[PDB]
Design goal:
monomeric; Nuclease A; 5-stranded mixed barrel; OB fold (Dihydrolipoamide Acetyltransferase, E2P); Staphylococcal nuclease; 3 helices; hyperstable variant; alpha+beta; hydrolase; monomer
Length: 123
């Protein structure tokens, strides 16, 4: 997998962001993250708005959903947004869809720790 550059257009919700990706606006849905809805939106908005650099990383399977959203791991300043959400207990690891599961175990590990800390949705 490779990290590619992107520019924030606008925050949307805890697991959805609008980016300029190779010169076109695209909505990206954060892979593997299920949505504390308003706190998830708040946290993702702060994450991408305060970042000096945003990167998209497609997984190994399909790159867009039926709705035309990009399906990716979004990084802000090197830090994976999908993991930071789960780590904060602001989202659950979702079901793998279409074989895009490369970071699944990593996120399950972040999720069990949020769960052990009884953080947020694990309260």
């Amino acid at each position: 997998l490779h990290k590619e550059p992107a520019t924030l257009i606008k925050a949307i919700d805890g697991n959805t962001v609008k980016l300029m990706y190779k010169g076109q606006p695209m909505v990206f849905r954060l892979l593997l993250v299920d949505i504390y809805g308003p706190e998830a939106a708040a946290f993702t908005k702060k994450m991408v708005e305060n970042a000096k650099k945003i990167e998209v990383e497609f997984d190994k399977g399909q790159r867009t959903d039926k709705y035309g959203r990009g399906l990716a791991y979004i990084y802000a300043d090197g830090k994976m947004g999908n993991e930071a959400l789960v780590r904060q207990g602001l989202a659950k690891v979702a079901y793998v869809y279409k074989g895009n599961n490369t970071h699944e175990q990593h996120l399950r590990k972040a999720e069990a720790q949020a769960k052990k800390e009884k953080l947020n949705i694990w309260s």
